[PDB]
Design a protein around this ligand. Structure first.
Ligand SMILES: Cc1ccc([C@@H](C)Nc2c(C(N)=O)cnc3ccc(C#N)cc23)cc1
Length: 847
């Protein structure tokens, strides 16, 4: 129409990419996908309750962990209900619904709502108050549960806009040639084309051109006939073309298209270059950069389209099925699993390994696989196992029906668990052969159902659209779909957040880049900071905006006075904001560190695995006091990081008593904690929160292979909460497992070889946290494995992915694992500050 064009440009600005752009396409899959997603969008918009979607209660079905009954076991929960200037405390029973708090409130004094003080967080719906996230949050941080008796939000604001032959012959392909605008880097070199028919990372068969000398234009015009017959090409198979001289470029093309058609015609594919196994390598997307990218020209021209297992082998099948996900299946293992596929079908944990034994390059076999899939009885009734469900969505599976069953299983995850695996489900869209998939439809649907899932979905897709040329197209189409159903209100918030971000990026692109060597932040530099901000504050940066890593917090006016440019190299901005909420329980500002220059995706990955580890521990009634702080990549190499209220780095606690020396003293940390604590009640509580948090980061770090850090990369609160930071240093550009130094030891009651009531508690907390994570070996393995394939371009080999197997003492028993971890604690005590002193030499100087 007309206003429908004005809308697209809004979406385009929100998305950060134009989805109707067709300058880097070779078929209509993307446009076909924007079409396929209209249905599930509209099917969910029309399906959600307008009142509960406007209010997004954040609730859980999980048991209330035992470490929180140790604060309300007496069946009484206090809830401060506030009004204008009058408030009232009320005692509640863990099972009282927010609706039932008109009977134990209005009587003491029906169409009102209970909203949390200073937040867009509502306590409503037919749910027990114990099961509210905000409630468990206060209980955990021993906080008063302050709410506000106010009227519900008008759903009318969520208004969604509206809106409306040779079939059995061997497969062949012709390599016409390749061409690059420029190349001179060395002398004359040799070069050839490797064509692989792939399906879920396995080479069905491979062919090569003869090698020619490497010139601007290299022409072959040769047909390459393959060992697979066209009728055998499975759906989702990939023609992967690579250039060696060794591996320099690659591009992929789906053999079968989105409409079940075999691919026919001429093609000129602009390739991706390698910098000398990675999710980028599997993309069907071509390089948009035509001016400077290698291209390959091809021609495609084809037409279309119950004996029971015996004892001993039974034990083999079983020995196979119980192995870790990162264990190769030999040719004998595959034959066993396949021939006894009906036995294999009764063990859900065997699905990944059975599906990796299917000869996808033989259509009769695929057909039996589908016949097999039609049963599925057990799988349908199996207890949802996320680590198992994720294993079917990695790079090792390309079949749509296989991956669809994994999604079918995800359908039963509740909102708060979706929130836990969300980032990783989004990353997993990178392993889908087609743009429209059961996984993508699912994320569309969960985000459209719940405002909080929607909020994060938006940011996660946008960080990929902003810094991934390989998948931005696919992801933009998915974000547009979501944006077209989230609602007018949310569309308005997202607009406010994007405006602020672009405004902050531009302020940083001016102010930043005025310092090329560590410490140098002058009055001149700040003058400009507080100046451009001063221009912005003036009826420009929106009234307010939801905090991207904390959607329930609305940030208001910028306290320009409190802003500065941080000491460090990349010159991040230290921003301070007034909370636009008046009913907020305090005066405190909102501190956000806005950085440009770094891709923060790797950090989000790390912090989310941490939120995952805490979720595991909760199942085992443990609370390790990790502080996984807000961190959202918000655009190309830019982002928002949360500032934790009263924290400093471990290095500066050492620095502010000694100096710029590596002559670290055991005392200063406990000295800092006592000094910063008012009463002795708060000091003991802080020694205790330190004990927990320290154990927390020790295991967490070790398990992830990131425990060996300089103490400037570690921080603590005035309350004893320890926490790691900047996970990009290490995963971007003599050793130890984690960080258990004399100062941490001093706080716990020891120095070199001793033992104490706190240190003994520390050791025990570790072991029970480590062993709880081993109960989830397979799961942490597939997460890590997936994290390295989609999060970091470098660490992308079999070897790197293995690290975690050794770390989780896979195969060994809880007993030996107890020793293995105590060992580690021991390689730490047997080094005091060796390493900290080395990192000081290494990093702080230039050694
Ligand atoms: C870019 C940047 C890196 C490192 C910092 C550290 C030193 N400061 C942080 C401070 C603080 N009081 O300064 C408070 N909270 C934080 C939370 C997270 C990170 C991360 N990652 C750093 C800080 C700040 C900003």
């Amino acid at each position: 129409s007309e206003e429908s064009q004005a809308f697209q440009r809004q979406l385009t600005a929100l998305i950060g990419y134009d989805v109707t752009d067709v300058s880097n396409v070779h078929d209509d899959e993307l446009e076909f996908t924007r079409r396929g997603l209209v249905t599930p969008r509209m099917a969910e918009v029309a399906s959600r309750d307008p009142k509960l979607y406007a209010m997004h209660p954040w609730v859980t079905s999980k048991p209330l962990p035992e470490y929180l009954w140790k604060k309300i076991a007496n069946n009484c929960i206090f809830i401060v209900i506030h009004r204008s200037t009058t408030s009232q405390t009320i005692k509640v029973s863990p099972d009282d619904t927010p609706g039932a708090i008109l009977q134990s409130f209005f009587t003491k004094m029906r169409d009102f709502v209970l909203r949390v003080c200073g937040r867009d967080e509502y306590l409503v719906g037919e749910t027990p108050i114990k099961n509210f996230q905000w409630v468990r949050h206060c209980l955990k941080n021993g906080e008063e549960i302050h709410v506000v008796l106010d009227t519900p939000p008008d759903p009318a604001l969520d208004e969604v806009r509206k809106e409306e032959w040779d079939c059995d012959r061997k497969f062949r392909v012709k390599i016409r040639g390749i061409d690059i605008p420029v190349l001179p880097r060395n002398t004359d070199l040799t070069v050839f084309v490797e064509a692989n028919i792939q399906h879920g990372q396995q080479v069905l068969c491979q062919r090569r051109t003869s090698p020619k000398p490497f010139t601007e234009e290299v022409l072959w015009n040769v047909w390459l006939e393959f060992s697979i017959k066209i009728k055998d090409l499975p759906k989702g198979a990939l023609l992967n073309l690579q250039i060696y001289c060794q591996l320099l470029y690659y591009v992929n093309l789906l053999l079968i298209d989105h409409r079940f058609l075999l691919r026919r015609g001429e093609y000129v594919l602009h390739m991706w270059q390698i910098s000398g196994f990675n999710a980028d390598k599997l993309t069907s997307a071509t390089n948009p950069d035509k001016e400077n990218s290698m291209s390959i020209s091809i021609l495609l021209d084809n037409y279309c389209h119950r004996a029971e297992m015996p004892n001993q082998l039974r034990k083999q099948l079983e020995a196979i099925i119980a192995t870790d996900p990162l264990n190769p299946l030999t040719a004998e293992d595959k034959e066993l699993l396949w021939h006894f596929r009906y036995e294999s079908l009764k063990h859900p944990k065997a699905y990944p390994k059975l599906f990796s034994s299917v000869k996808w390059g033989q259509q009769e076999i695929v057909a039996k696989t589908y016949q097999l899939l039609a049963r599925r009885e057990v799988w349908d009734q199996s207890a949802l196992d996320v680590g198992l469900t994720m294993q079917l969505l990695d790079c090792n599976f390309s079949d749509e029906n296989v991956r669809a069953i994994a999604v079918q299983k995800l359908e039963s995850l509740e909102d708060d668990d979706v929130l836990h695996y969300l980032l990783q489900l989004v990353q997993a869209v990178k392993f889908e052969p087609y743009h429209d998939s059961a996984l993508a439809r699912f994320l569309l649907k969960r985000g459209l159902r719940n405002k909080r899932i929607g909020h994060f979905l938006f940011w996660f897709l946008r960080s990929e659209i902003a810094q991934s040329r390989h998948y931005q197209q696919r992801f933009a189409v998915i974000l547009e779909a979501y944006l077209r159903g989230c609602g007018t209100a949310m569309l308005h918030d997202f607009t406010q957040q994007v405006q602020v971000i672009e405004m902050l990026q531009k302020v940083t692109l001016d102010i930043k880049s005025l310092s090329a060597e560590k410490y140098d932040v002058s009055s001149q530099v700040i003058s400009q900071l507080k100046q451009k901000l001063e221009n912005l504050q003036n009826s420009q940066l929106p009234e307010s905006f939801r905090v991207p890593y904390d959607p329930g917090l609305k940030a208001g006016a910028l306290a320009i006075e409190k802003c500065k440019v941080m000491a460090s190299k990349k010159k991040p901005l230290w921003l301070e904001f007034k909370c636009a909420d008046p009913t907020a329980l305090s005066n405190e500002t909102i501190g956000i560190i806005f950085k440009h220059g770094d891709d923060l995706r790797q950090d989000m990955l790390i912090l989310q695995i941490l939120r995952i580890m805490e979720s595991i521990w909760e199942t085992e009634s443990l609370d390790l006091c990790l502080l996984p702080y807000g961190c959202i990549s918000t655009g190309d190499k830019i982002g928002m990081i949360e500032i934790v209220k009263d924290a400093t780095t471990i290095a500066k606690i050492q620095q502010s008593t000694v100096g710029n020396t590596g002559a670290f003293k055991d005392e200063v940390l406990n000295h800092w904690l006592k000094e910063k604590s008012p009463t002795e009640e708060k000091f003991q509580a802080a020694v205790e929160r330190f004990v927990y948090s320290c154990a927390g980061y020790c295991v967490a770090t070790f398990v992830l292979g990131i425990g060996d850090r300089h103490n400037d990369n570690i921080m603590i609160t005035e309350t004893g909460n320890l926490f790691h930071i900047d996970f990009g240093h290490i995963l971007g550009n003599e050793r130890v497992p984690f960080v258990l130094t004399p100062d941490f030891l001093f706080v716990m009651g020891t120095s070199g070889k001793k033992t104490s009531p706190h240190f003994q508690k520390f050791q025990d907390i570790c072991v029970k946290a480590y062993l709880a994570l081993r109960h989830h070996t397979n799961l942490l393995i597939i997460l890590f494995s997936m994290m390295l394939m989609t999060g970091m371009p470098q660490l992308t080999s079999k070897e790197d992915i293995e690290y975690i197997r050794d770390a989780l003492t896979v195969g060994k028993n809880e007993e030996d694992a107890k020793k293995y971890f105590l060992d580690q604690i021991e390689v730490c005590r047997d080094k005091g500050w060796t390493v900290q002193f080395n990192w000081f030499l290494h990093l702080v100087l230039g050694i």
